[PDB]
From Swiss-Prot, chain B:
Family membership noted in the UniProt record: Belongs to the orthoreovirus mu-1 protein family.
Shown stretch of the complete protein: 43 to 189 of 708
Protein name: Outer capsid protein mu-1
PTM characteristics: Cleaved during the endosomal proteolytic disassembly of the outer capsid. Mu-1 is proteolytically cleaved into mu-1N and mu-1C during the maturation step to generate the ISVP. Cleavage of mu-1 to mu-1C is dependent on myristoylation and binding to sigma-3 protein. Mu-1C is further cleaved into delta (59 kDa), and phi (13 kDa) segments during entry into the host cell cytoplasm. Mu-1 and mu-1N are N-terminally myristoylated. This acylation is essential for the membrane fusion activity.
Domain of life of the source: Viruses
Organism: Reovirus type 1 (strain Lang)
Disulfide bonds: none
Functional note: Major outer capsid protein involved in host cell membrane penetration. In the endocytic compartment, outer-capsid protein sigma-3 is removed by cathepsin proteases, which exposes the viral membrane-penetration protein mu-1. Both myristoylated peptides mu-1N and phi are released during infectious subvirion particles (ISVP) formation in the endosome. They associate with host membranes and mu-1N induces permeabilization and delivery of transcriptionally active viral particles into the host cell cytoplasm. Seems to induce apoptosis in the host cell.
Domain remarks: The C-terminal region, phi, determines both targeting to intracellular membranes and induction of apoptosis.
Curated annotation (Swiss-Prot), chain C:
GO cellular component assignments: viral inner capsid
Job of this protein: Inner capsid (core) component.
Protein name stated in the entry: Inner capsid protein sigma-2
Keywords: Capsid protein, Inner capsid protein, Virion
Keyword Nuclease: no
Family recorded in the similarity comment: Belongs to the orthoreovirus sigma-1 protein family.
Main subcellular location: virion
Subunit structure: Interacts with protein mu-NS; in viral inclusions.
Record carries keyword Chaperone: no
Subcellular location: Virion
Swiss-Prot record, chain D:
EC top class named in words: hydrolase
Subunit structure of this chain's protein: Homodecamer; each decamer is made up of two conformers of VP2, called VP2A and VP2B. 12 homodecamers assemble to form an icosahedral capsid. Interacts with protein mu-NS; in viral inclusions.
Cofactor(s), by name: Mg(2+); Mn(2+)
Organism encoding this protein: Reovirus type 1 (strain Lang) (T1L)
Keywords for this protein: ATP-binding, Capsid protein, Helicase, Hydrolase, Inner capsid protein, Metal-binding, mRNA capping, mRNA processing, Nucleotide-binding, T=2 icosahedral capsid protein, Virion, Zinc, Zinc-finger
One GO CC annotation: viral inner capsid
Gene name per UniProt: L3
EC number: 3.6.4.13
Catalytic reaction list: ATP + H2O = ADP + phosphate + H(+)
Protein name (database record): Inner capsid protein lambda-1
Full protein segment contained here: 241 to 1275 of 1275
Length: 215, 122, 417, 1031
């Protein structure tokens, strides 16, 4: 019932079976978090951070930096944060990078906001679905962890992900808006749909400063 | 009906992205699998009718008295269906008539052989 | 210890449908809806009074064969791509729950609905179903039946019997535990041991596992005449007073001044007798059950791919390119081997061995005639009811009546010592 | 109270039964004597003239008869005997003994009830045959009748009659009589013990095989009984290991190693069967609190005996003497605390609730709750808060911690206030009012929602609860190899613990204060001390009083007690050791430190299934029954116990526990109860099978005796039949304990078994049992098939009859008259009659006509076919209208009955006889729902041919049914007159055919009356005989 998810990449003192305790932390506004979820979240964030600063000749602490649930599967549901976190852990293993710009250290407030966005419910774009039969490895994934793994890890030869490999440079924030070059497309649509879409996204209405026509 | 059979590339019944899908293979049931058009079936049926038109000579020739019955070869199944992967992802279908090209070829070759044999009587 | 669970569905021998009728399924489910029961496969028979002969069950093996066909159709429903457990009726059979512990009469709308279109020779992997994967103990317990069925399906001819020898099995007070059954008949000991294994799973190298292996080894050596009062193993041997008896049972026995000599080493293998009388052979089926439990407990070496049908070659859990070779022995010829070894030892007169052989010939002729007659009746029934065609037992040939190198296999067993 | 008694122990059935008589339920009876002596035939010709004992009866007519245990001599009577009387006599009362409530007439019976009665008859025959056959003895023959064979020798004299019957071949054949010829046909060599288990040094045969007269079918029933018993057998070494493991080293038992000597120890059954019996047990105990109270007292006594811990009141007096004050103080906290004390079994009950938390929740006595709810100005109320604070962590109320927080919150209302969820649960709401997780305030979930500045004490209390709530643990328990698993909603061997366990290292430990309970006590005292140090609260209290109160709180934190240490290590060991002795297995629910969502809120059970739902999980939600009850405790006594724990001064854990355990380890009740539950499970399956024969269920059913008529069954008839089966089953096992009661509740045609429970999040957990195999079911199907083969053998008549006048010199069988004289429904000129047919009176001598079922109108003569029921409806009118036409008229009618009782009437062939008057009586006495057994009149067979004499008969059967005859004129060498019948070869095939296999059976075509029997001498010694406990 406590359930077991572990980083199989290194046994600190040997294989260790983590079990979730009764204690859970809701200290982060406003979500309530089980110990299992908190550990998974930190490990997952660390893995994503590793992908962000990935260096070709730079060594990693563990090729496997994600806890994977070995036991407690009957107590585990897809809708649960833990299940999505496992999908995210698999994505981190594949090296997946978050579209939103990532700070070197996510703020506690930033971490909470990230949790809130994860809380936003949507179709999961990644097609990975968990198997306790074995850890699933993509055939074309960039990292060598599958070669490193000796037990419990399986790479599907038919499993190939069609995504390019790219890591961006410094992405600091910008104070004021700037022009974006716009190009139109041949597709045509009803004016009414556009009006309704504008009403959904309109910032109207408010009072701006007039300024001076002549000086 | 039209298109080709598509099977989930990795997870059965949990397919959402095109990446999750692949052309269904004969080994999944590796010869070709194709959706059979009703129009083609009706035309083969008309062909069999022409054979019945030439039935007397073939019987007098004591050869292949049994009519072909093309409808027997048709196989109908529920599955994701599309000419391309995108359609099948948005186009799951039920009871689609299907057959392999080689079987169709054998059937046609038999019909052609029959026409060649009936050549003199007509 | 076996770690991979998979099974392959039975293929009809030129049949277009499972060879069972609803009448047969009802007879099998006389009062129960769970086929997992071992007694469900076979009404336990104590030998002598052993052997179930019925209009639907000429042999207990016949009943097991029908059960296997029915299970192969029913199991496909939760093993379907949907893996649904209650939506459709296979021949009006609906699983009670997702774990598929029990089956039930199909709902009337479902009864109206068509049965699952099972495909023959479908190899399946147990892990594919989630609930079974969720319970390892449940999965292993279910797998004992699956393993026995697969083994019968694997043998085109008669089923092999797995025999292994370990002196470390002799070592221990577990030997004293085996000595608890001293003076017990092999059949009685086997029923109790099987019940104990059913009660709980045991270690692949478990003391119980070694004991079962020793019991099987002693019984087979005695059956071949390999071990006798004049050839005792540590003085311990299963002894059957009269060979060819209706329920001749080697019973644990001790002989003084006649200790046998065994080559040091570990030897594990399976031997499949040529004779088709095995359907009426209680010892063979009991041995098959024990061997299957042994396979669930421990993963044996894959048998030779050439030793297996080409279609089943390279089975991940069962068949390997290099593997043991099945040994085929006619039961009558094997009884002759037991008699010959004793005659060669001089324990018994040549005349006595000849008398035993004559009794065996008489028994064999009677059984062969009955089996051939049942075969004619079955063919007549199949012609009579194409709609409800079924097989009382897997079909058999007069070819099985031959020794089939029983003597070569006997030399092999003697060499195994 | 019977349910509590059943939980404690079960009525003991007589499992082992041994038969010293013959294992047979059938004996041949003589029917008609021969015409002897006669002048022409020398009496010297007949062997019977010397009155020489014969293997079979010597008579002109004789038939086989069923007489269950007619020759049996048994230690225990199963009291299920079935005897069919001769066909010339009426047994309808047995046939009508079940549902013929309105049947006043003795002869009349209702046809529909017949199938149930016949089925019950088969079941009783099985019940009467449940015996173990003890290996018998043989004696070498001292005479030349046999070649010195070893004959099974019975105790008592006059066994020679048995010897001659067992071996008719032993009879000599100077005569050429039919008996002599049959004996000559029988194989000479198949006599004496067939085989025996004899070879080992000083070992007699455990079993022996022998040829003897007998019946395989009862032998088969006994064989299945032996098979089931053999299935349950366990070995002494296994028992030695189990007892030693249960002792856990406190006690040691030992068993020797020796060759198999044959000891029967049947104790192995599936855990599923045990869970099923427990589920029925929970069903019976649902909603009855009084049942658990005696159980708690019993458990309390067991705990009281096992624990070495002792209550020491002097501790309280010492701590109170430590409370110190000057004469000047206005109030005494020591006096107040003593009053708060206001001063074991309660401790034991709460602990039992830990193991039985699954079905019971502990709660404090209402009188403990402060009447005014507490006042900040009352030190006594602060003491009340402290006592409650100590108890709540030991209470199992799901909201107890939140309730305690509220209790403090309720006291602080207006001094310190908190943000509640809504007005309904307002801050003036009683803390006890908040009985659900929903009551837990959102502000209680969010501590930051509370201002520490505006609510410092409350904020501190909340922080302490979050950082200091006790941590539970779990323990492994139970023996799977022998005792299996009693766990219901949890994994096997798991026992929940209210707190995490750290082990003690000494048999004589020293007091330890590093305890979660000790930490809790210290935290509570510190919180109270800070409340005292409150700037707005301290000024009222005297500075001297303040110092005294602070010191008292410090002393309470420092109080020395052994209870926490005992609970931490010894309590779990004691509980694990006690668990085996408990009659009722524990019911537990997972302990969540703060996981309210997983708190269980509902429990449901289904003992029946939905009309369309065949999956138990799908129908359980609408077919399950809610359950669950609370337990009330006194916090004061428990708090005092916690405050005054003391161990024996010279306490050595190993010695004390070992000494208590040796006497303690004498429990065998579980195995006996298991056998009773196992029998109850067989009864359940047998009941369902009988219901299946009588009803159509969701499970598919087979029917092959449907040719026997049966009524449409309503739930009322269903209950009557079920009640009859239950009563008979209970009587046959001689057990009076509750059986089938849950199944009897409601309609059992669609009943299904499952149970479920539901958590706060609403997730529910189901439990569906899988039945083990039943020998009874296989036997019933076999008997039904056998009855179908031999209904006549049960004295049962199948087919229809034809009432028509027949007088001739031919001597046809009333059951087998000549075919050229017979007619049937399909015969020409025969009329079938339906409701539409009517009758037109004749006039002026003109022909009257009866309207046809098709409306054709003709007079009462010729060939007709009458539904028997239609005549029964109009018996008086029909007897009045057709009796003259039936007696002398050409009218011929075939009566349709399908199945009916028949009776035999013999007559002297020498004199003319007319049966019209007797037939007239039978038809006239026919009733629409009831009639007497159909009567057949048969002439007396003779030993010589004579010219025929006139006879008139009116009734014939539709099918041959005279197979019951065993032999004719057996006293004579040959049958010279009348029907000729030889002893049936098929019934003695093992002897008649030398080439036939010994084990070959002719079932179900023929029942062999001579069989080879195996008799066992296996021993059933007591465990204490081979297993010795070693101190």
């Amino acid at each position: 019932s406590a359930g077991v998810l572990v980083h199989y990449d290194k046994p600190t003192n040997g294989h260790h079976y983590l079990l979730g305790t009764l204690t859970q932390m809701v200290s982060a506004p406003p979500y309530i978090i089980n110990a299992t979820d908190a550990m998974l979240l930190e490990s997952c964030l660390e893995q994503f951070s590793a992908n962000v600063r990935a260096r070709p000749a730079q060594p990693v602490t563990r090729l496997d930096q994600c806890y994977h649930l070995r036991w407690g599967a009957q107590y585990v549901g897809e809708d649960s944060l833990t299940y999505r976190l496992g999908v995210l852990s698999l994505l981190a293993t594949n090296g997946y990078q978050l579209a939103r710009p990532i700070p070197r250290q996510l703020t506690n407030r930033w971490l909470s906001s990230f949790v809130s966005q994860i809380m936003s419910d949507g179709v999961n774009e990644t097609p990975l679905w968990p198997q306790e039969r074995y850890v699933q490895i993509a055939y074309d994934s960039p990292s060598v962890v599958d070669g490193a793994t000796q037990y419990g890890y399986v790479r599907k030869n038919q499993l190939r992900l069609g995504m390019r490999i790219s890591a961006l440079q410094s992405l600091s924030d910008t104070p004021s808006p700037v022009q974006w070059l716009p190009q139109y497309t041949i597709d045509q649509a009803a004016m009414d749909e556009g009006d309704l879409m504008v009403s959904r996204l309109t910032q109207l209405p408010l009072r701006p400063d007039y300024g001076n026509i002549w000086v | 009906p039209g298109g080709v059979p598509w099977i989930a590339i990795g997870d059965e019944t949990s397919v959402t992205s095109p990446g999750a899908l692949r052309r269904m293979t004969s080994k999944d049931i590796d010869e070709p699998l194709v959706v059979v058009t009703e129009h083609a079936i009706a035309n083969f049926t008309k062909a069999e009718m022409a054979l019945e038109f030439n039935r007397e000579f073939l019987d007098k020739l004591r050869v292949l008295s049994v009519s072909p019955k093309y409808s027997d070869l048709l196989t109908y199944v529920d599955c994701y269906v599309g000419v391309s992967a995108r359609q099948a992802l948005n186009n799951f279908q039920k009871q689609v008539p299907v057959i392999t090209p080689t079987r169709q070829t054998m059937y046609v070759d038999s019909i052609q052989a029959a026409l060649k044999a009936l050549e003199k009587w007509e | 210890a076996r770690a991979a669970f998979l099974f392959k569905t039975v293929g009809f021998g030129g049949l277009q449908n499972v060879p069972i009728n609803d009448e047969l399924s009802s007879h099998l489910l006389r009062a129960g809806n769970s086929p997992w029961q071992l007694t469900q496969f076979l009404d336990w028979i104590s030998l002598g009074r052993g052997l179930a002969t019925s209009a639907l069950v000429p042999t207990a093996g016949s009943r097991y064969y029908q059960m296997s066909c029915l299970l192969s159709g029913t199991l496909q429903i939760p093993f379907r791509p949907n893996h649904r457990w209650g939506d459709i009726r296979f021949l009006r059979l609906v699983w009670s729950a997702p774990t598929l512990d029990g089956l039930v009469v199909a709902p009337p709308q479902v009864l109206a609905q068509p049965a699952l279109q099972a495909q023959a020779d479908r190899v399946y992997d147990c892990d594919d179903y989630p609930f079974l994967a969720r319970d390892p103990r449940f999965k292993h317990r279910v797998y004992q039946q699956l393993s026995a069925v697969t083994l019968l399906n694997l043998t085109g001819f008669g089923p092999i019997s797995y025999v292994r020898v370990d002196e470390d099995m002799w070592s221990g007070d577990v030997n004293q535990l085996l000595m608890n059954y001293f003076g017990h008949t092999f059949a009685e000991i086997a029923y109790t041991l099987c019940q104990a294994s059913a009660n709980r799973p045991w270690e692949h190298d478990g003391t119980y596992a070694r004991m079962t292996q020793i019991i099987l080894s002693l019984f087979w050596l005695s059956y071949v005449g390999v071990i006798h009062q004049q050839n005792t193993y540590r003085t311990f041997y299963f002894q059957c007073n009269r060979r060819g008896d209706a329920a001749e049972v080697w019973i644990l026995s001790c002989s003084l001044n006649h200790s046998a000599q065994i080559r040091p080493g570990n030897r594990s293998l399976f031997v499949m007798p040529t004779s088709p009388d095995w359907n009426m052979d209680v010892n063979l089926i009991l041995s098959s059950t024990l061997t299957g439990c042994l396979c669930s407990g421990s993963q044996l070496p894959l048998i030779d791919n050439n030793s297996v049908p080409a279609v089943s070659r390279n089975i991940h859990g069962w068949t390997g390119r290099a593997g043991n070779q099945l040994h085929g022995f006619q039961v009558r010829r094997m009884v002759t081997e037991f008699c010959d070894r004793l005659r060669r030892d001089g324990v018994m007169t040549q005349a006595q061995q000849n008398q035993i052989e004559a009794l065996a010939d008489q028994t064999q002729q009677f059984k062969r005639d009955k089996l051939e007659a049942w075969a004619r009746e079955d063919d007549q029934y199949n012609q009579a009811n194409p709609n409800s065609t079924m097989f009382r037992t897997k079909p058999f040939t007069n070819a099985q009546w031959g020794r089939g190198n029983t003597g070569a296999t006997s030399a092999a067993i003697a060499a195994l010592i | 109270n019977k349910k509590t008694a059943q939980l404690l122990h079960a009525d003991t059935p007589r499992l082992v039964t041994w038969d010293a008589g013959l294992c047979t339920s059938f004996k041949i009876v003589p029917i008609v004597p021969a015409q002897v002596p006669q002048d022409v035939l020398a009496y010297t010709f007949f062997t019977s003239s010397y009155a020489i004992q014969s293997p079979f009866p010597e008579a002109a007519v004789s038939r086989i008869v069923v007489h269950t245990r007619w020759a049996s001599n048994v230690d225990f009577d199963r009291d299920s005997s079935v005897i069919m009387a001769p066909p010339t006599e009426n047994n309808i009362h047995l046939f009508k003994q079940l549902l013929n409530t309105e049947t006043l007439s003795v002869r009349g019976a209702n046809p529909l009830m017949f199938r149930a009665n016949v089925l019950h008859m088969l079941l009783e025959f099985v019940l009467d045959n449940l015996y173990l056959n003890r290996h018998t003895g043989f004696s070498q023959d001292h005479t030349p009748f046999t070649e010195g064979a070893n004959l099974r020798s019975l105790p008592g004299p006059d066994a020679e009659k048995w010897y001659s019957i067992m071996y008719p071949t032993r009879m000599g054949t100077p005569n050429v009589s039919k008996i002599c010829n049959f004996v000559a046909s029988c194989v000479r060599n198949r006599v004496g013990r067939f085989d025996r288990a004899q070879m080992m040094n000083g070992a007699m045969s455990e079993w022996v095989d022998v040829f003897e007269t007998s019946d395989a079918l009862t032998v088969s029933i006994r064989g299945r009984w032996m098979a089931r018993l053999a299935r349950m057998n366990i070995n002494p070494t296994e028992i030695e290991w189990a007892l030693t493991e249960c002792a856990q080293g406190y006690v040691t038992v030992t068993s020797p190693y020796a060759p198999s000597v044959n000891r029967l120890m049947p104790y192995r059954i599936s855990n599923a069967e045990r869970q099923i019996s427990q589920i029925i047990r929970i069903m019976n105990i649902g909603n009855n609190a009084t049942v658990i109270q005696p159980v708690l007292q019993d458990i309390s006594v067991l705990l009281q005996r096992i624990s070495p811990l002792q209550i020491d009141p002097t501790i309280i007096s010492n701590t109170m003497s430590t409370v110190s004050e000057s004469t000047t103080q206005t109030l005494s906290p020591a006096s107040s605390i003593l009053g708060k004390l206001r001063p074991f079994s309660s401790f034991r009950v709460a602990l039992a609730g830990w193991l039985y938390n699954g079905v019971v929740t502990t709660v404090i006595d209402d009188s403990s709750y402060p009447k005014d709810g507490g006042s900040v100005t009352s030190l006594e109320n602060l003491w009340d808060f402290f006592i409650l604070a100590l108890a709540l962590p030991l209470t199992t109320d799901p909201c107890a911690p939140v309730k305690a927080f509220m209790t403090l919150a309720n006291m602080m209302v207006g001094f310190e206030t908190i943000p509640m969820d809504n007005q309904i649960y307002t801050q003036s709401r009683r803390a006890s009012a908040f009985s659900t997780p929903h009551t837990w305030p959102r502000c209680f979930m969010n501590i930051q929602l509370i201002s520490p500045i505006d609510a410092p004490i409350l904020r501190q209390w909340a922080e302490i609860i979050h950082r200091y709530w006790p941590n539970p643990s779990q323990i492994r328990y139970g023996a799977p190899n022998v005792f299996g698993s009693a766990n219901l909603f949890t994994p096997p061997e798991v026992l929940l613990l209210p707190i995490d366990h750290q082990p003690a290292n000494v048999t004589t430990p020293t007091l330890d204060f590093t305890n979660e309970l000790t930490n809790w006590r210290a935290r509570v005292c510190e919180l109270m001390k800070n409340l005292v140090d409150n700037q707005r609260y301290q000024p009222g209290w005297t500075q001297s009083l303040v110092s005294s109160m602070r010191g008292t709180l410090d002393k309470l934190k420092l109080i020395k007690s052994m209870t926490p240490m005992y609970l931490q290590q010894l309590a779990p060991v004691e509980l694990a050791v006690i668990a085996p002795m408990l009659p009722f297995p524990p019911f537990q629910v997972p302990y969540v430190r703060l996981d309210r969502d997983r708190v269980p809120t509902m429990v449901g059970v289904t003992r029946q299934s939905r009309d369309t739902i065949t999956q138990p999980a799908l129908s359980l939600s609408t077919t399950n029954t809610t359950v669950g009850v609370p337990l009330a405790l006194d916090a004061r006594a428990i708090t005092v116990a916690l405050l005054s724990g003391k161990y024996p001064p010279d306490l050595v854990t190993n010695v004390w526990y070992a000494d208590a355990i040796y006497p303690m380890y004498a429990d065998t009740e579980v195995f006996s109860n298991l056998q009773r539950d196992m029998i109850t499970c067989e009864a359940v399956q047998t009941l369902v099978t009988l219901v299946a024969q009588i009803s159509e269920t969701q499970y598919p059913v087979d029917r092959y005796l449907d040719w026997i008529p049966s009524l449409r069954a309503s739930a009322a008839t269903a209950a009557t039949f079920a009640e009859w089966v239950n009563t008979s089953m209970k009587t046959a096992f001689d057990l009076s304990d509750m059986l089938l009661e849950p199944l009897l509740s409601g309609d059992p045609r669609m009943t299904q078994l499952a149970i479920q429970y539901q958590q706060y999040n609403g997730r529910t957990f189901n439990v569906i049992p899988e039945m083990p195999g039943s020998v009874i079911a296989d036997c019933v199907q076999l008997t039904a098939e056998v009855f179908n083969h031999e209904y006549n053998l049960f004295g049962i008549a199948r087919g229809d009859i034809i009432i028509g006048r027949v007088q001739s010199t031919h001597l046809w069988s009333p059951l087998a008259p000549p075919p050229d004289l017979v007619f049937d429904r399909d015969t020409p000129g025969v009329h079938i009659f339906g409701r539409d047919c009517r009758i037109s009176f004749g006039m002026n001598g003109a022909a009257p006509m009866i309207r046809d079922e098709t409306g054709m109108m003709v007079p009462f003569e010729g060939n007709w076919i009458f539904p028997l029921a239609l005549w029964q409806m109009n018996t008086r009118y029909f007897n009045q209208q057709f009796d003259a036409w039936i007696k002398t008229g050409e009218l011929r009618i075939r009566i349709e009955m399908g199945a009916y009782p028949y009776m035999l009437h013999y007559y002297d062939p020498r004199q003319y006889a007319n049966a019209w008057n007797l037939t007239s009586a039978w038809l006239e006495e026919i009733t629409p729902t009831s009639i007497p057994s159909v009567p057949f009149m048969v002439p007396i067979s003779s030993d010589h041919d004579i010219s025929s004499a006139p006879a008139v008969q009116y009734i014939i059967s539709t099918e041959y049914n005279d197979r019951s005859l065993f032999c004719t004129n057996s006293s004579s060498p040959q049958t010279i007159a009348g029907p000729d019948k030889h002893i049936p070869v098929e019934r003695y095939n093992i002897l008649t055919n030398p080439d036939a296999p010994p084990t070959q059976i002719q079932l179900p075509e023929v029942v062999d009356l001579y069989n080879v029997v195996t008799r066992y001498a296996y021993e059933t010694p007591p465990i204490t005989a081979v297993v010795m406990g070693v101190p």
